[PDB]
Symmetry: D2
Subunit: 432 residues, 4 copies
């Protein structure tokens, strides 16, 4: 492995966040998508960013729909330092009221085209994966590629679930397809050994699917967005396929690592309960070499009055009273009162703590303090930031609902997952 | 409403008395400079004074320590018009066998401090737990036009006999000291804490004020006192201060109010550490929305617990807890507690790094005992310094109940009944302490 | 002796008004957001307000600007990115000058929801094209002590200079009770006041019986939301409409006297004079550097300036210049400037260059018959503003003999405003051309 | 490289010690802090090269601590760092300096230790230099500098085999031993027409040592040595260790003495290419940002000179000179063939008045002075009508009590030296 010029001074990271589907609502109701809490100590945005930094990419642009003081403070307090690097948030619009990937990038082509760089690293979507973009860049160069598309291998089963690419002798992408049913699926079968897989697993996974992350030569992208296809919206559907029709060197690169998508409540839910996996969680946030970074907070060590946790992870600066936590992920600052039970749940915690004087007024006012009230029962749920769950609240959804837009009540049910909205106040005794 | 003009940042220099040799806090100091001794699961002593200075708006700070340490330099380096530099008297991680007093350590570097264009020097002992905004303290030093201002800690007769008591006049000016006075000498030190603005009731119970290693000194005064006046004084506030007073210099007292404990003793250190899990609320809390205690950003992941039962305990960052019972203890960063373990009344300083599966399967094929508390162990009333490789079935419970014990070879010490396993130490399986 | 509490850092948000379409400083603003315009040889306009904030202890700063530019972004990134920040809030996200108008109020209102996300007590509103230094704290301190809703920095002046500003009338306590936009005749005469009321002596108060707003305001957070969302949702001008209206509602709009140099540099003529002004003798009315509150800028690490044979009178030389055998009189020479053999620079502002062209490059340019960046051989440039990366060819004489005053020749690389010739950025004027 | 330097290589800069060769420049400040090129300090050379080489771990060994030296380092420069390690507890060998801190260096988990000793202007990507030490399974790769003969015999030399391996060391060898040192630099890198022109390789004082190796060489194999050059490395070779050589051909000019120093400085003003520029499109020499204003010039006629930052120049002439930062030059003064270190700050017109009515001169070149072939240090106060011209073309001398010291005919005014009006030199 060796890139020259150095990636740090020759590559520009462009993360496609913000602009995304409301597939994560209500989590994206009162906040920029990139800012969505993850793993109890992190935020979605921290993944591609950390990967960029760990991959020696120091020039990072975070694309988003609108501006967030929260996103900034997070990115500013955790990365604003890396020299000659930077991590700037570029926002699509001027307000949270109301795009298309290629559109997103094109909007700021005027800014992008200013940096002296060889390639643009286009990272889009929402995934939990650990990649070293460097090897991916090297391939892009050692092939005089104009566009190098990262590809995920898969057997013909889950193959008709994604968009498939076809490669020639050299691995040059020659054709595309969206869930080719069956009569025309086999046509997409290529022998992936050409991309680095061993005959064994290549015969198992004879299909390649776009991963939604690319490397494009500084000049190509400018020409593609600015001239060849100025009216396109998405990349993996228009630009990429179109640059192919023009006969450009569109190369494939195979990623054989962990890759879990999390653009939906269920996927996200399950992804998060994933680090409580036995005996080894397939994805680990911490890594001796390529760890995921976050905002330094200087929170105290979690306190535990009399808790009986089992198969769960606990975030920083927690205050936990006598209770029972099972198979769950407790976010930072999370307060859990007496006799509470938490099961297969993701408690995102809080952004700040409330003092005793505070819990004092709230009481006299008859309101509920931040946290899980006394003797509450939380099952299969996501309790967003600053939730105020009153006493005796039971979130068990016994009738087993699957859809509910109970916003006014501070919640939402999707795929059977109850999700207490951020800053929501769930009154004592309420059952769900 | 009142501010330091000029600002603390550019007119004050922090001089932290990190420590020297670490005789008192041994074995914790063993080949580790005192300022770096692990504190409250995620911090190090040096964090308190430094943090207090940063929050107090003092960005220029030095840390004197008889010997140096690799980690102290890594901590400060990574953790921190400002700077934090270590000024060692001996560039060796080895515990010095020669003595160096505080005025010695300070005077030895007086020449470098002189190079700084500041009005005062803030002399702080890096051995106590507590929070303080030195801004008013300094503010006071200037408004009272004193040569040296001394922080005063009020206390009752009982606590009084183990401190350096001051006697002030009606204007708060100090005019006489007494080192750990008793009998009649003590009686003669009774003062009217009212003068310093103390509560009238909290005054009847605490008619004594003690120096507390906190001082503000005008530049010139310092150079004068250490160069001309007392060039042979070893102890700073034990001689140099009382000495200044006796020369007619303006030595004013500034009443200090709040939690304050000296933690240079194994017992004192122990206590203050387990004192963070005091059922109601710890009298001292590292966290503070306004002035928190800073430490090194480690990016450790959330602590995992397979089947734990924690009571009156605090868990640091990135711990890996299997099935076990943790009671009234402190668990430092990267701590590994194995299956069947039982922790009672202990302070686990944790580890400096995690051991991988490679070192695992290796130390498992050759048998060696990995870092952490081995299976079915039992640690009662102990301190387990960093990277302790504790075999399985170990029972650290001081059966014979020995107060003082020095078995540095077997990998540990014992003080006031506290079994402190030495850093890096290895206690073979079955061992019983 | 006394300071804010809380301190400006956590309780004061800085909102800067970098500019609209920059139609006044054209062509210096041609495809360049106003905040970015090169200033004083080694700075950009935006450095004045941002630096005043930082030096006043204000770490949370936003910069408003109708459009955007790469340079503004790169600059703020490098010079200040380092709980503070200096983010740009643009109306239009393109470098193209907006052909549509937007006001200072429409501007702020547009992002009020963002400003709304900041737990601050006040909003410091600063214009972004005024040359001056100021410790905003005491001024904010006044806003809190007098429990005002809006405090307006006031500038004393004489009848002659008053007619070009927005004047205000104060009562005995200094509470503003009236406004008048660019008042003249008896309209003006009624705006006379007693300056001693704000702390001026009687000698100067007699010399300057007027006080004009100067685009500096402190504003309680909610007074802002209320005024912009409810009380005047249709206002476009923040200072000539929204303020008076708030006054007209009986809100506590208090004045605060400003002492010192202050100069508007948003028009060409004034921009020219202010920039040339640092060459003043025996001293400059305004100095960029200062022991305690300097005007910051991006660290470039450029090498010291190189001079082969320069007869330089009353001038300023920025970082990394390359002068040969020439004459530089009463001029400002920007960073990376390249003045050639036998050149004569009289009374001009050389913006400089964004980069150095290597020998090789010069070879290609010569072979293609083009001009390298910089003032060419035997060039005579007087009373002009030469924008960044200009390629002035050999023997060019920008001397405007026909004494023209206004001329729009954007196609030839220059506009003439008030007799001041301005060469557009990256312009190229061929050998022997006389302007 | 892989792992990369940033994380696998530690930087150890040595530039303290006596180095008295530079008296009185190093009289007060530590050696690394010596002013340079109008806007720099010696230390910026080896530290800048490191950074531009992706070397983050950087230590700087100095005889003693310096308030101004650390401010310069902190202000100018999250895995990397640049820390100063003092050898003594007060300002009143070389293998010893490294050994003394082995305990500190030992802890860092790296693969190599870049050692940089001595002071001299030069730009080099230590990366290709480490890539070498790695592919050649070297345990110590030494800097190889080719040269003719007048040079070849002046410095120690290295004989290599047909693998680049170093087998011998000869300190200033002449005659038949000098001949037994010819090597044909074809192996190192240079071609045939270049090599023939210089078949002699001399060590530079820069080496790449494998982490462990250096730990063994300093505490075991040779815990009583003083120099890396003539003792540790030569011995290290004899003991039979893979000691390689690394060719380096690029502007190399030492500056350990006033004359070398002085000449290198004025050298940056030499016509065409000065041989060495601090700035560079790729790897520039970094320095502390002072936000100094542009330089004012009332009526200066300057020739073949270079103006540093924030200078306040009145009526005067400047010839073949290098004016440092904050230089205040007065009317009628004439500066030629000199180097002005500049000044560390400015004095207000209100502060100056307090000088006249005190019988003292304000920092900077007073009125109608005449500076010829001299080095005027920082904060130098030179009253009206001074004439540092060295009339009786002396050479060496000494007049500490007279704010100056003469060496190689160069009058070097001590930092803060107050030279009264009318005096001459
Ligand atoms: N030689 C030394 N250099 C630096 N710090 C030291 C040295 N000796 C002790 N210290 C540390 O300095 C601080 C002051 O020591 P100590 O608690 O004895 O203060 P004291 O008795 O109030 O006053 P003094 O030490 O002047 O007599 C403590 O935090 C201690 O660990
Ligand atoms: N759309 C805009 N966005 C940001 N700044 C703007 C905009 N339009 C003008 N500006 C800037 O706003 C300032 C104009 O305000 P100024 O202090 O001159 O007061 P004014 O012109 O008398 O009244 P008003 O504030 O209503 O324009 C200038 O600094 C100008 O460049």
């Amino acid at each position: 492995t060796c890139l020259d010029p150095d990636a740090s001074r020759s590559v520009l990271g462009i993360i496609l966040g913000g602009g995304a589907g409301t597939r994560l609502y209500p989590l994206t109701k009162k906040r920029a998508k990139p800012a969505v809490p993850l793993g109890a100590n992190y935020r979605l945005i921290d993944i591609p960013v950390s990967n960029c930094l760990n991959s020696n990419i120091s020039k990072i642009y975070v694309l988003t729909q609108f501006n967030s003081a929260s996103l900034n403070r997070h990115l500013s307090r955790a990365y604003a330092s890396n020299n000659e690097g930077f991590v700037e948030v570029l926002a699509a619009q001027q307000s949270p009221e109301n795009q298309g990937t290629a559109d997103a990038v094109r909007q700021y082509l005027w800014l992008f085209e200013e940096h002296t760089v060889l390639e643009y690293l286009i990272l889009a979507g929402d995934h939990l994966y650990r990649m070293d973009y460097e090897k991916f860049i090297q391939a892009h160069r050692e092939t005089d590629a104009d566009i190098t598309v990262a590809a995920l291998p898969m057997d013909e089963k889950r193959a008709t679930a994604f968009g498939l690419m076809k490669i020639d002798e050299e691995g040059r992408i020659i054709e595309f397809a969206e869930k080719p049913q069956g009569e025309q699926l086999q046509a997409m079968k290529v022998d992936t050994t050409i991309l680095g897989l061993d005959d064994k697993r290549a015969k198992e996974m004879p299909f390649i699917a776009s991963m939604g992350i690319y490397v494009i030569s500084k000049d190509v992208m400018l020409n593609l967005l600015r001239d060849k296809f100025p009216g396109a919206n998405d990349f993996g559907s228009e630009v990429i396929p179109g640059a192919t029709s023009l006969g450009m060197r569109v190369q494939a690169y195979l990623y054989d690592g962990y890759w879990e998508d999390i653009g939906t409540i269920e996927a996200f839910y399950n992804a998060n309960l994933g680090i409580t996996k036995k005996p080894v969680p397939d994805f680990s946030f911490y890594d001796r070499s390529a760890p995921i970074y976050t905002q330094p907070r200087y929170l105290p060590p979690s306190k535990m009055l009399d808790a009986d946790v089992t198969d769960s992870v606990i975030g920083e600066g927690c205050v936990i009273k006598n209770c029972k936590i099972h198979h769950s992920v407790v976010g930072l600052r999370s307060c859990i009162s007496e006799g509470a039970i938490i099961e297969d749940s993701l408690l995102m915690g809080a952004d700040y703590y409330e003092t005793d004087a505070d819990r004092k007024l709230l009481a006299a006012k008859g309101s509920v303090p931040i946290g899980i009230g006394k003797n509450c029962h939380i099952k299969r749920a996501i309790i967003d930031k600053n939730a105020r769950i009153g006493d005796n609240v039971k979130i068990i959804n016994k009738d087993n609902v699957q859809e509910a837009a109970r916003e006014t009540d501070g919640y939402f049910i999707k795929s059977g997952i109850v999700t207490v909205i951020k800053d929501a106040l769930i009154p004592s005794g309420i059952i769900i």
